[PDB]
């Protein structure tokens, strides 16, 4: 009599190449990064260039000031909340722990400070979120420092290594 | 400094696709648009303005991205994801005698980034009272429960649920409480012989 | 002598265009409105907070820019999105002009938590529509 | 309206969720009171007034670093330059009635 | 930076019923009651009398946004009469159009 | 693991690809999670903790420390037909109305000792 | 898991002006002939508020300036669909929804018989 | 270098374009091929679809192309390029 058929479950990638991947490619067109005015069309790859690192910068300064005052981009109005619309913090969040302070200001001056702290309030540096951090930031530092953790703590080998 | 650079208009073709230039709803921009529309209110003796620095293009939502071609191609392309229609529901009678309830949807729209509605909660019920198994003394007793939530002409329960944010919530508790008149029409309390 | 916020008219040496030489008499017949949203119409909320938030973008938009905007602004509230519509002048470096661009789409996006796209529009002067 | 009318009232309050035995009217307010949203808890009243501090602040920051071309302080910064050049200017902490 | 004190105080007791909302909902709720002793209504009035004033919707006072008037102001989009009208002749309000019949 | 998040930084960066129409960017604006879900609805994000109406509609289960015949009673059954009929506020709430106005009538014991009436 | 069956169901669209609208419903019959729903066209009575305010600041009460408030209704009646089919016309709606006008979905969804209505005993 | 047309953008764009010289370089050899390997209409193809969707040319690709286009008759359009390469 009356047939159920079963549903069919998709997200955003059936709905999504269904409506926008149907289409074909213009033929003179522009990259659409930029603008699509006339009298502001990229003649050559130097314009290119310079507008693409004029947005960077653009995007650059806005995160600064952005962090430099997070008192004034809380109040949010939205209801599914954007996870992108929230700044970093970088400043450390605990003062009387050891290894959970070290690991808060490595991670999130910074990491001479974090290892200070951690030699101070006697932290063992694990091989994660601490050699890596301080290899990429500072490269004699960072093997005296490699080397400092490895003979005054003897934990993973291989790691470390 | 200064520069001078020529528009899309004699730099495109004629043989090509149009929503492969305007996908998106664009808010028209005298570029890409060869067709030098005039819209406004002139003067006496003179010529309005044509499609540079028009206001009026730009202020009303141009629609140019829905090219009937296109309109075609995106149709076909939504064929996987679609459902044919059963044989057996063709006619309105056949749909009351095999589904006869009904639960109504509210879902409405706000301009802004807010997605809550406060009138999105409502979800009537509506179920058809000729196809359930009501005798007399049964259907009487709901009858004088319900009160005015019936219908006596097209006999539809009409009953309007709303205590809570969500809607499933909402619909459930509706058909408990159905599932508790149909329970109390087939009892009979020590009350009911001073009638 | 009820004057809105139309051009006075003097001698013959105010190039004005064709929103500041209309009354608002003439906006639903030979004009029209700058936004759009669905906030007006009867049986919505969120009016107010939308009139905040675009006259506080407009202000903005005037501040930040000194004397680019030839004319005003067209925002349109498509349920998530912000469209600026507005026109700049060929004044400056393009590079300036992009600039500008990302920082204000940025801060308009982060700050009112809505993807925002600009659109410009280069005029080469100043609009003009009669010597009113 | 008898005692099975009231007996059928008082079941149809009890399913649907109302007040079964009766009551006067006074005692109805704290029902019809709970069963909505007060008014100092509000969408719109609490909201009446936004956080008019943090945009003046924000104001003020994008004006001190220059994003902000503020021409309305920009003139009342001219005036009380004026002002002050003229030999009228704001005195100090603790001096006027008394000097 | 503002210089009107009269909407600040407003806001501030507008802030201050936000917070103090539900004892004063506890309050009235024990008050309209016909039943319970009137001894429970006498302290309950005290307590809600004995309360620092500036924190009560009765206070509440709908001004504008731009210009902090007490008197004349919609309830809509929380302005005033003459904001509305000038806003409305520039071109903001979609819709708003002056009224010809 | 910085490793992990170099190596994810170095597949971002070589699977790049710039924009050609617009149908990119909704694509793109889409990705990151700036517009809506689609068949947009009024139920994503706010679903009340994942609750039912059993929580919602039966509010017997947090009634307790009160008697079954009389004025408090009735006032419990009141305040509890009250804030079932309340689409406003979450059950979380209620049963915190529900204990402070228990801790208030428990506070103040001597007027309904003196009320010719017993307190349960 | 079983779909979700519609019978009647019906997006009412509010506008401004009439020519977006009409252009809009006139999509919206076409892609319907071009997939098979078979809808109808009706058009719902309007409202129009007007309301008097004062013209100056002192007194002008004798001269007052009025606004309107047009806001025309457009609604279609979309019936013989199933609900994937609902769901792509919804999203197809939404996808090419300008911003002058509104939308109000009302679906109405089958359903046979719970599990307590035949002879059920508590 | 019809296999790196196909997997360049046509399947997925990620292997097409690492950086901008290397795509401008990459571009301007395909422009030379095509217009070094076929007639006219390939030429005429690959600088619809790279000098006028990419950049600008440089020296030698530009240079490849004015004698393509003198050797197959197609001197007209010698302005713009000529621009586009100042
Ligand atoms: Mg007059």
């Not at chain 2, 730009?58 to 044989?87: G, Q, R, S, Y």
């Amino acid at each position: 009599e009356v047939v159920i058929p079963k549903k069919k479950t998709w997200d955003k990638v059936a709905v999504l190449q269904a409506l926008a991947s149907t289409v074909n490619r213009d033929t003179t067109a522009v990259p659409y990064v930029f603008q699509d005015d006339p009298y502001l069309m990229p003649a050559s790859s130097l314009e290119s260039r310079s507008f693409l690192l004029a947005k960077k910068s653009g995007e650059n300064v806005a995160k600064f000031i952005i962090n430099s005052y997070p008192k004034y981009f809380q109040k949010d109005i939205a209801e599914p909340h954007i996870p992108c619309l929230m700044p970093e913090y970088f400043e450390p969040q605990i003062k009387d722990i050891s290894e959970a302070a070290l690991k808060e200001r490595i991670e999130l001056e910074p990491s001479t400070d974090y290892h200070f702290q951690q030699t101070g309030q006697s932290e063992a540096l694990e091989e994660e979120n601490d050699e890596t951090s301080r290899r990429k930031a500072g490269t004699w530092r960072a093997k005296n420092n490699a080397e400092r953790i490895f003979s005054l703590m003897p934990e993973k080998n291989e790691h470390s290594y | 400094r200064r520069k001078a650079l020529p528009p899309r208009t004699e730099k495109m073709a004629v043989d090509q696709d149009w929503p492969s230039v305007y996908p998106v709803a664009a808010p028209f921009k005298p570029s890409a648009v060869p067709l030098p529309v005039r819209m406004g209110y002139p003067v006496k003796k003179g010529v309005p303005m044509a499609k540079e620095g028009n206001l009026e293009l730009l202020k009303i939502p141009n629609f140019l991205h829905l090219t009937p071609v296109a309109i075609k191609k995106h149709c076909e392309a939504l064929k996987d994801f679609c459902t044919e229609w059963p044989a057996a529901l063709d006619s309105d009678e056949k749909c009351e005698k095999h589904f006869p309830i009904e639960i109504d949807s509210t879902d409405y729209v706000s301009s802004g980034p807010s997605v809550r509605n406060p009138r999105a909660r409502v979800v009537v019920l509506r179920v058809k009272l000729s196809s359930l198994n009501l005798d007399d003394h049964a259907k009487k007793k709901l009858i004088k429960l319900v009160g005015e939530r019936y219908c006596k002409t097209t006999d539809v329960l009409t009953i309007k649920t709303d205590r809570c944010p969500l809607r499933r919530q909402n619909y459930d508790y509706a058909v408990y409480l159905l599932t508790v008149l149909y329970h109390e029409s087939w009892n009979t309390e020590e009350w009911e012989k001073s009638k | 002598k009820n004057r809105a916020a139309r051009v006075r008219v003097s001698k013959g040496d105010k190039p004005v265009t064709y929103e500041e030489a209309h009354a608002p008499h003439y906006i639903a017949h030979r004009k029209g409105w700058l936004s759009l949203h669905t906030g007006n119409l009867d049986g919505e909320d969120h009016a107010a907070e939308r009139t905040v938030e675009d006259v506080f973008l407009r202000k903005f938009m005037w501040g930040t820019f000194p004397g680019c905007l030839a004319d005003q602004l067209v925002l349109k509230r498509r349920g998530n999105q912000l469209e600026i519509c507005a026109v700049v002048l060929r004044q400056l470096s393009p590079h300036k002009y992009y600039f500008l661009v990302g920082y204000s789409e940025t801060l308009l996006s982060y700050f009112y938590k809505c993807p925002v796209r600009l659109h410009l529009q280069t005029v080469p002067s100043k609009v003009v529509y009669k010597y009113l | 309206l008898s005692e099975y009318a009231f007996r059928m009232s008082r079941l149809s309050a009890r399913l649907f969720g109302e007040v079964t035995r009766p009551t006067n009217s006074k005692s109805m307010k704290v029902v019809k009171l709970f069963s909505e949203l007060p008014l100092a808890k509000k969408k719109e009243t609490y909201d009446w007034y936004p956080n008019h501090h943090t945009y003046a602040e924000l104001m003020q920051t994008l004006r001190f670093l220059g994003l902000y071309r503020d021409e309305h302080q920009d003139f009342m910064d001219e005036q009380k330059r004026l002002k002050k050049l003229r030999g009228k200017e704001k005195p100090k902490k603790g001096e006027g009635k008394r000097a | 930076h503002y210089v009107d004190w009269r909407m600040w105080r407003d806001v501030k007791r507008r802030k201050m019923a936000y917070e103090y909302a539900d004892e004063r909902l506890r309050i009235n709720s024990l008050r309209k009651n016909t039943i319970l002793p009137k001894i429970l209504q006498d302290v309950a009035d005290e307590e809600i009398a004995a309360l620092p004033r500036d924190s009560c919707p009765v206070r509440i006072r709908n001004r504008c946004v731009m210009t902090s008037r007490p008197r004349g102001v919609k309830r809509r989009w929380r302005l005033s009469r003459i904001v509305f009208r000038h806003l409305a002749d520039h071109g903001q309000l979609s819709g708003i159009q002056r009224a010809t019949w | 693991s910085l490793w992990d998040v170099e190596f994810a930084k170095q597949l971002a960066t070589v699977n790049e690809q710039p924009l050609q129409n617009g149908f990119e960017e909704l694509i793109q604006w889409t990705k990151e999670g700036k517009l809506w879900e689609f068949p947009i609805n009024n139920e994503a994000g706010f679903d009340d903790d994942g609750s039912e109406f059993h929580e919602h509609i039966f509010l017997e289960k947090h009634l307790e420390s009160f008697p079954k015949q009389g004025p408090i009673r009735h006032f419990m059954e009141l305040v509890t037909c009250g804030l079932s009929k309340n689409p406003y506020l979450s059950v979380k709430q209620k049963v915190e109305h529900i204990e402070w106005f228990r801790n208030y009538f428990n506070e103040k014991k001597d007027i309904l000792k003196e009320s010719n009436i017993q307190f349960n | 898991e079983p779909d979700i069956l519609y019978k009647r169901l019906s997006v009412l669209v509010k506008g401004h002006d009439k020519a977006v609208l009409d252009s809009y419903e006139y999509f919206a019959v076409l892609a319907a002939k071009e997939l098979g729903i078979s809808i109808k066209v009706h058009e719902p009575p309007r409202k129009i508020e007007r309301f008097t305010l004062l013209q100056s600041v002192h007194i002008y009460k004798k001269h007052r300036v009025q606004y309107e408030m047009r806001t025309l209704y457009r609604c279609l009646e979309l019936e013989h669909l199933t609900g994937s089919t609902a769901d792509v016309y919804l999203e197809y709606i939404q996808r090419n929804l300008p911003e002058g006008v509104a939308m109000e979905v009302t679906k109405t969804q089958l359903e046979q018989l719970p599990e307590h209505i035949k002879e059920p005993i508590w | 270098a019809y296999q790196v047309h196909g997997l360049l953008k046509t399947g997925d764009n990620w292997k097409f374009i690492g950086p901008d010289q290397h795509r401008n370089f990459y571009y301007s050899k395909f422009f030379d091929l095509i217009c070094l390997m076929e007639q006219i209409d390939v030429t005429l193809k690959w600088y619809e679809d790279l000098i006028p969707s990419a950049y600008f040319p440089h020296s030698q690709t530009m240079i490849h192309l004015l004698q393509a286009l003198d050797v197959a008759n197609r001197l007209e359009v010698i302005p713009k390029i000529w621009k586009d390469s100042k």
